[PDB]
Amino acid sequence: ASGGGVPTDEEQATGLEREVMLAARKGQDPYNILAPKATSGTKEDPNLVPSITNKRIVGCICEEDNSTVIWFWLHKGEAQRCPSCGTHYKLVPHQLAH
Amino acid sequence: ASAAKGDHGGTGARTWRFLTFGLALPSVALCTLNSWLHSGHRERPAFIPYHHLRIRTKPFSWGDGNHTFFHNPRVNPLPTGYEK
Amino acid sequence: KIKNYQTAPFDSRFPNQNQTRNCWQNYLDFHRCEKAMTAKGGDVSVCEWYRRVYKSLCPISWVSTWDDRRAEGTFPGKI
Amino acid sequence: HYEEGPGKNIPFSVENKWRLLAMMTLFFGSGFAAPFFIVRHQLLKK
Amino acid sequence: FENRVAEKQKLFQEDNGLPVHLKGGATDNILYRVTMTLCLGGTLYSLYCLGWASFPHK
Amino acid sequence: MAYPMQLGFQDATSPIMEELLHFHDHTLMIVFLISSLVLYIISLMLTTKLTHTSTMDAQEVETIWTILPAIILILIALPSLRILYMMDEINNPSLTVKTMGHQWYWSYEYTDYEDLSFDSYMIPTSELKPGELRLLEVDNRVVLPMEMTIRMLVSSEDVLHSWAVPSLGLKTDAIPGRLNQTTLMSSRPGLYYGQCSEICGSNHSFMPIVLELVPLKYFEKWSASML
Amino acid sequence: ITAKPAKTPTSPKEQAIGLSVTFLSFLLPAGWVLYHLDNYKKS
Amino acid sequence: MFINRWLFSTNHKDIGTLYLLFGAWAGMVGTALSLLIRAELGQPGTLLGDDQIYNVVVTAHAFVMIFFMVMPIMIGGFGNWLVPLMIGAPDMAFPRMNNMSFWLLPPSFLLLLASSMVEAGAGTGWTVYPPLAGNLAHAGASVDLTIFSLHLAGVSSILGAINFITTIINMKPPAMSQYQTPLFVWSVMITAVLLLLSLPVLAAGITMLLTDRNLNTTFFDPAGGGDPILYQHLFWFFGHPEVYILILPGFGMISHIVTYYSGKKEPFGYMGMVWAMMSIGFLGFIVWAHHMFTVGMDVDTRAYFTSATMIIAIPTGVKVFSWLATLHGGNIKWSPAMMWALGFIFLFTVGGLTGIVLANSSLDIVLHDTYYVVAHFHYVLSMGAVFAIMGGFVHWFPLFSGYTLNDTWAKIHFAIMFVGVNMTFFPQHFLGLSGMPRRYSDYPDAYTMWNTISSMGSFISLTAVMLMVFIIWEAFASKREVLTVDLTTTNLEWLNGCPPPYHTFEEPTYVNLK
Amino acid sequence: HQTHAYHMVNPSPWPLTGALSALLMTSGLTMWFHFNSMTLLMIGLTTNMLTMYQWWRDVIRESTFQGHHTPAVQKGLRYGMILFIISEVLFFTGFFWAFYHSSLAPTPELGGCWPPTGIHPLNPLEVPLLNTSVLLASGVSITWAHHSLMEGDRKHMLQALFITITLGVYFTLLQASEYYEAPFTISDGVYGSTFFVATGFHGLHVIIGSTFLIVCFFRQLKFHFTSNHHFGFEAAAWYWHFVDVVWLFLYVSIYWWGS
Numbered sequence A: 001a002s003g004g005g006v007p008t009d010e011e012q013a014t015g016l017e018r019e020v021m022l023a024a025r026k027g028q029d030p031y032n033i034l035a036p037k038a039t040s041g042t043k044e045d046p047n048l049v050p051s052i053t054n055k056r057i058v059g060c061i062c063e064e065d066n067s068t069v070i071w072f073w074l075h076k077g078e079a080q081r082c083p084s085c086g087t088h089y090k091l092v093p094h095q096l097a098h
Numbered sequence B: 001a002s003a004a005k006g007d008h009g010g011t012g013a014r015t016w017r018f019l020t021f022g023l024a025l026p027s028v029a030l031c032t033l034n035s036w037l038h039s040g041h042r043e044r045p046a047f048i049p050y051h052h053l054r055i056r057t058k059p060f061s062w063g064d065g066n067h068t069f070f071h072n073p074r075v076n077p078l079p080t081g082y083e084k
Numbered sequence C: 001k002i003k004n005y006q007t008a009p010f011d012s013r014f015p016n017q018n019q020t021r022n023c024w025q026n027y028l029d030f031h032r033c034e035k036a037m038t039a040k041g042g043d044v045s046v047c048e049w050y051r052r053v054y055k056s057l058c059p060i061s062w063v064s065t066w067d068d069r070r071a072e073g074t075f076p077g078k079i
Numbered sequence D: 001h002y003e004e005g006p007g008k009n010i011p012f013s014v015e016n017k018w019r020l021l022a023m024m025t026l027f028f029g030s031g032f033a034a035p036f037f038i039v040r041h042q043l044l045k046k
Numbered sequence E: 001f002e003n004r005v006a007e008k009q010k011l012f013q014e015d016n017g018l019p020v021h022l023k024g025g026a027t028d029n030i031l032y033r034v035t036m037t038l039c040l041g042g043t044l045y046s047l048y049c050l051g052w053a054s055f056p057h058k
Numbered sequence F: 001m002a003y004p005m006q007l008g009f010q011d012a013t014s015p016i017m018e019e020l021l022h023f024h025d026h027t028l029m030i031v032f033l034i035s036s037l038v039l040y041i042i043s044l045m046l047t048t049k050l051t052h053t054s055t056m057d058a059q060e061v062e063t064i065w066t067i068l069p070a071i072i073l074i075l076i077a078l079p080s081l082r083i084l085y086m087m088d089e090i091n092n093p094s095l096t097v098k099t100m101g102h103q104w105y106w107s108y109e110y111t112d113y114e115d116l117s118f119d120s121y122m123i124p125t126s127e128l129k130p131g132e133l134r135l136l137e138v139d140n141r142v143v144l145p146m147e148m149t150i151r152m153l154v155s156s157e158d159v160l161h162s163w164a165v166p167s168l169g170l171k172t173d174a175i176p177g178r179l180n181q182t183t184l185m186s187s188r189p190g191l192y193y194g195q196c197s198e199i200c201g202s203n204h205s206f207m208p209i210v211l212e213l214v215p216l217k218y219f220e221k222w223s224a225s226m227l
Numbered sequence G: 001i002t003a004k005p006a007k008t009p010t011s012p013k014e015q016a017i018g019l020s021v022t023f024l025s026f027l028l029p030a031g032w033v034l035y036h037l038d039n040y041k042k043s
Numbered sequence H: 001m002f003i004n005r006w007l008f009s010t011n012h013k014d015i016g017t018l019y020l021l022f023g024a025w026a027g028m029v030g031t032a033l034s035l036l037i038r039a040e041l042g043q044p045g046t047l048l049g050d051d052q053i054y055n056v057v058v059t060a061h062a063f064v065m066i067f068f069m070v071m072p073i074m075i076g077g078f079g080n081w082l083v084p085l086m087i088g089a090p091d092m093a094f095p096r097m098n099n100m101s102f103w104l105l106p107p108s109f110l111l112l113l114a115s116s117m118v119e120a121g122a123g124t125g126w127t128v129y130p131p132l133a134g135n136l137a138h139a140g141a142s143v144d145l146t147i148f149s150l151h152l153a154g155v156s157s158i159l160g161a162i163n164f165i166t167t168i169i170n171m172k173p174p175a176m177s178q179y180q181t182p183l184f185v186w187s188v189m190i191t192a193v194l195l196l197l198s199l200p201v202l203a204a205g206i207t208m209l210l211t212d213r214n215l216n217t218t219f220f221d222p223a224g225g226g227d228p229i230l231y232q233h234l235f236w237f238f239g240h241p242e243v244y245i246l247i248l249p250g251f252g253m254i255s256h257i258v259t260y261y262s263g264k265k266e267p268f269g270y271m272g273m274v275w276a277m278m279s280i281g282f283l284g285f286i287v288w289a290h291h292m293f294t295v296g297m298d299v300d301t302r303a304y305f306t307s308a309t310m311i312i313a314i315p316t317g318v319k320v321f322s323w324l325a326t327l328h329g330g331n332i333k334w335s336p337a338m339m340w341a342l343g344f345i346f347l348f349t350v351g352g353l354t355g356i357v358l359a360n361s362s363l364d365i366v367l368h369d370t371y372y373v374v375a376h377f378h379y380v381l382s383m384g385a386v387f388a389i390m391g392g393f394v395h396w397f398p399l400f401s402g403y404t405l406n407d408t409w410a411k412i413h414f415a416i417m418f419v420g421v422n423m424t425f426f427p428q429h430f431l432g433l434s435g436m437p438r439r440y441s442d443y444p445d446a447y448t449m450w451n452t453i454s455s456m457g458s459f460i461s462l463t464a465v466m467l468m469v470f471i472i473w474e475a476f477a478s479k480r481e482v483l484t485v486d487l488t489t490t491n492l493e494w495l496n497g498c499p500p501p502y503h504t505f506e507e508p509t510y511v512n513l514k
Numbered sequence I: 001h002q003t004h005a006y007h008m009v010n011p012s013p014w015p016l017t018g019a020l021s022a023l024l025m026t027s028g029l030t031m032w033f034h035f036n037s038m039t040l041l042m043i044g045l046t047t048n049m050l051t052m053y054q055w056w057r058d059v060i061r062e063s064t065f066q067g068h069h070t071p072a073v074q075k076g077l078r079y080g081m082i083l084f085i086i087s088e089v090l091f092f093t094g095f096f097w098a099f100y101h102s103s104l105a106p107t108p109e110l111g112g113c114w115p116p117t118g119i120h121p122l123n124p125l126e127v128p129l130l131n132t133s134v135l136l137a138s139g140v141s142i143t144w145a146h147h148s149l150m151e152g153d154r155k156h157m158l159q160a161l162f163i164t165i166t167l168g169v170y171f172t173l174l175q176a177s178e179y180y181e182a183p184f185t186i187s188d189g190v191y192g193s194t195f196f197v198a199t200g201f202h203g204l205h206v207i208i209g210s211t212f213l214i215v216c217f218f219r220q221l222k223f224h225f226t227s228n229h230h231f232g233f234e235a236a237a238w239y240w241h242f243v244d245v246v247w248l249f250l251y252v253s254i255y256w257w258g259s
Ligand SMILES: CCCCCCCCCCCCCCCCCC(=O)OCC(COC(=O)CCCCCCCCCCCCCCCCC)OC(=O)CCCCCCCCCCCCCCCCC
Pocket: F007, F008, F009, F028, F031, F032, F035, F036, F039, H350, H354, H422, H423, H426, H427, H429, H430, H433
């Protein structure tokens, strides 16, 4: 009526699939599958934007339900503000792969 | 509907195998019985050169251009009637 | 007799632009009636109306083709 | 990896503007001429 | 049968710069050349047929 | 027929075509008003240094430009459908004539009483008599009685064709295996032209229709002599 | 939009050449076939 | 490396480039065909002296302009180039299948050219109606090669539709809802849904015509109990959605161009624009019979189709007025692209309005199969589609190439074209109202003036096409490299430079959910 | 390095070989229908098969062997298959439209009735009913196979999948025999036309579906599928259900109601 012989993801997943799986297990999101939650976005509490380089494009949905997204490059260094709503973003560079 | 059986507490592999061997395959066996019973070649009807049948607007790209792809001499008459 | 026909009048059974069936129907009726009358020993003059109507509405090539087919035994319609 | 940047993300060369003019002329000219020659072809068959 | 997926995973992840359609080895090359030769030759042949059919044979 | 430099519809020959002319005048005014309004508004939006680039609210003006167009469409649909149904009303013709399209000419059949039929070919340009219309004349015209309701049945013996007479507001496709019906009624005597209106091959442009409308009396004599 | 000065400027003389060559590539072949239309019709 | 890149591509930008190239070439073929049509009608009498050839030219003109020029450019070209960039995606969902959608087009085009080369060509009209398109009235391989051309074009578009819908639904940043995607992305998805649903019906119908021609089936042959009208239904069920498929991506680009050159950060009434396009797409599936008002349909069926057809004007009106409302209060930049967009708004409205005239079955009886219909679609489709394509082409050329065009030359091009198309098509309204049939190689003498003027206007447009080729050459010849682009905060596709690198968004954008 | 979960595919020759094979097959059909020759058609069919084999082989390499099918990539493939099936439904819709158009308004050439005069339909209670029980049964066995795979049961998955394939083959053989036995042909008016083209395209889909299932059977034998990741099997099963439903509509419309 029952038996085995079929591999599991844990035993057979490989490459990027395996990485996403292992990272997900640790509660991490190296491959940007989840939408990050915003901080208060103040000068003192800026949105922390991870990046593997010295700049990353940020899209800001200023108010909930806005259909217009405000796009801009966020550079390493002093926090920058959305050109439309002024909320703060600060880049926190590299790593990902050990 | 709801059928006339029951299970539903949890539909799993065991349940679907139960349905395969207990309902599905038996249905196929019964229909196979019924079919290989009501078969037997039925007397082919008299040939009438109806104009809406045995259509030939261009010859078929095979054979002599006048035989349908799965032509059965026994039951498929040509535009001129059954074959020898 | 009850005639003096100009053309086939409006038939509520075939009120639309496609009159193919109106012609067909009247052709069948005339030939069904002509058969019954010639058979049971009667007069084909009662089938007159249908003959007039189908004559009026049906294209000559249709009537001609159908007549040829009834003669050949390949008329698909029931008469 | 491939070449990137202006004039490098295309299947034709823009290194020489005159060679380019010749390419463009053959390209668009061949397309524009085709119907005229097909019409000619059809008229010359009968 | 035995599970040899791990072996295949090793072979296909080997860093030799080969595109996936040729990463299996010598056979991929042959099959590719056969396919491409039939495609290109068959296309030339179709052009020839178009050339033939474009003109009347009265 | 159409005359040189004509801008609109040929003069109405039947009451229905007259009905269409008035309906088209009504619709065209609306088309002119809307297109000129749009062109005007474009020019209005583009001719000021004044600006307002911040977010503008839409759920208010969208009511206006949704309700207005809806009303305008109902104002077009009402007379359009009145005419549609009017054309469809039971008329009871005094005559039935059939026309069959062919590659490339029309044949006619008047088989109510006698079995009258003939072909109707375009008169080649080389054979036109002085003052005759190129591409429009035919050897045998469709003689019909004026001021009478006539039922026209249209079909074809080969490919699709379409029987049209613009002055009467008529166009009925000629489909093989089908018998399409339309009604014709000329308010005046005369010659009325039309042309095959469904691409039927090489000579699609050369198989015209010519109606000859005369009083009943002349129609009868003609019938007789055409036997 | 802002851009840098042309890297290989195309002078009015050069433009007249490009324009003329362009117009000719469209006009000549078609013109030839159209010119010989009668030579095709009945031959 | 050349073959790997251009023949074995799996890159959305390179594939979009191939589509643009292919489409431009097709446009030249289509234009040439259109010139031969107007040359034949330029003066009374016959020019080609072979009406079957004329019919073949008219037929090919339509197929080329629709399947090889407009669709490839809008969906394959602008779609492939812009969609992934506008949603921050690394490429299309199926980058390899995408390459096959492109490569099916050259073979498809070759089959079309082959049909005109063999026998006497397919002089059937692009509608390919039987029995004219059958094996007796069109014996030989021509019509069969045309059907096959359509099958290949059909597969390319269906697979492309699958790719676009999947990409747009599945590859946006995690925080971006469908209500935060640009209008062009919305226009492409809706177009893709119409393609997915409509093309398979066309495929069914032309396959039945194929079997009627070669396997002795009688779907459309009365002798076997078939019906030519069935073909028309199947054709037009795909046909109407197809005309909306031809204009929707145009609506999408016009929204971007009008917003951009009005100096606005967004289009007026975004949600109303989304609603309008979805409504149009929906309604576009229930009005097909307005192309069959003279085939002999019941009066109630005709009243329904008249009514359903007119309703489309409501959502379309919301779009037109929204574009005007986007211009409202803007700091207007009179760039060449803006000019094309404004010409589009006007010309499209004119064509749409004549479509409303035609929707009335009573009037359509007299206007059907006359030049009034040809005038109608050359305004909405020809000018509408072409103007949206030109606007988008001049607006995005710097992004695709990294080079700028000469604005003055571009404005001159717009001016010539505007004059040419109106001179060519406006007089055709008169020809239609007065009764001149479509698909005619010659016409009664009374129609001479308007046909003469129309054919002259057709030459003005030819001058504009040749100039356009020169203008593109000049841009590539001078090499003025792009430095700065305004409004990048609301135009993501420009944010990676001109041209953007082969691989963009390797590191996705960061978008907070809040 | 990328920091997104999507798949960047290696430049491939298959889209081109596929496109060319399409040209060879259509060119080929034309050559066969008009210039009595099957040379082009043969080459086209061959390169088409070669393209499909290599293209799908590569998809297996990219997923099972290279690990490119992250949840995001798999979700995309789900949408792709659903959309593909939708387009197939619309294709059949055109054939059902042709069937109903013809059958609901029988023309005078048919005798003004349906079925047409001279047409003796198959008994829907004989082989056509058997065919119906066969496909419905395979729908049950394939669901058993799916649950076995998810429950990690290799033997029973193979068993159930094998039964499903056998049933599809059984349907195909039965249909082939029915085609040979049928007293009517494709040339027998609109009845034969609608019957053979609709059931013919359906039969082609059964052969495609069975082939897809056989591919899954062999990938299963090779341990490609995990109890949690097996999209190829899911697509094959969705496609199989689609084939099952189209048959039910054909059975009810053409075989039963149209008799
Ligand atoms: C090119 C040839 C022109 C020939 C002109 C007429 C000669 C008359 C002789 C002598 C005149 C007097 C004697 C004859 C009266 C006949 C009345 C008739 O039977 O009546 C019906 C007739 C005639 O209707 C007329 O009553 C003529 C109306 C002409 C309107 C022309 C607008 C032109 C704009 C620019 C020039 C044209 C090219 C660009 C057109 C651009 C799109 C409109 O047929 C029509 O229905 C034609 C129009 C079809 C529908 C087009 C709809 C949208 C059009 C324009 C919107 C522009 C808004 C802004 C305002 C316009 C902004 C530009």
